[PDB]
């Protein structure tokens, strides 16, 4: 039973994370693209040594560099409006 149950458990966990891990909800079809981009970038960083450029990633993913830039823009995470800018418990963002 464990062999079949593991697939479904992993699927449910990943889907729930995709649907509920961000304040601004991104559909699953975009989360998949973002994860693919991240994995490709991580793989490239090891062998290239430098920071991969947008064009190389775009070619490796068979998409235009503008699409890579758009995906990166979508990857932004909102920041908390209650920070400690001031180095003291005096002022927030």
């Amino acid at each position: 039973f464990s062999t079949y149950a593991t697939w479904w458990i992993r699927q449910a966990i990943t889907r729930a994370m995709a649907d509920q891990a961000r304040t601004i909800r991104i559909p699953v079809h975009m989360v998949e693209v973002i994860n693919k981009l991240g994995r490709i970038q991580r793989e490239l960083l090891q062998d290239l040594g430098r920071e991969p450029t947008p064009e190389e990633l775009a070619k490796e993913m068979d998409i235009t560099p503008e699409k890579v830039l758009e995906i990166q823009q979508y990857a932004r995470e909102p920041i908390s409006l209650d920070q400690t800018i001031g180095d003291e418990g005096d002022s927030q963002l």
């Binding site: 991580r42 960083l45 090891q46 180095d87």
Partner: protein, 73 residues
């Protein structure tokens, strides 16, 4: 009372980053084949660099240099 110099402060963050890296290595170690497995596949360098960057840019000890005059610096 002892003194933590810059070297020790950086060493602590390196230790934390390597601990996170080791946790990731443990997670990945028992998930793929044992024959065609190489250090590159299961070694993720992101946590250590992330810790190093966080310390320099966020730690209260790492401070914006005072450049009013040579004596200040």
């Amino acid at each position: 009372r002892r003194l933590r110099t810059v070297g020790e402060l950086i060493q602590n963050q390196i230790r934390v980053g390597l601990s996170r890296m080791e946790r990731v290595v443990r997670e990945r170690m028992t998930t793929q084949d044992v024959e065609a497995i190489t250090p590159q596949t299961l070694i993720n360098i992101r946590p250590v660099v992330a810790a190093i960057k966080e310390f320099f840019g966020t730690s209260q000890l790492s401070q914006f240099m005072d450049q009013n005059n040579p004596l200040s610096g």
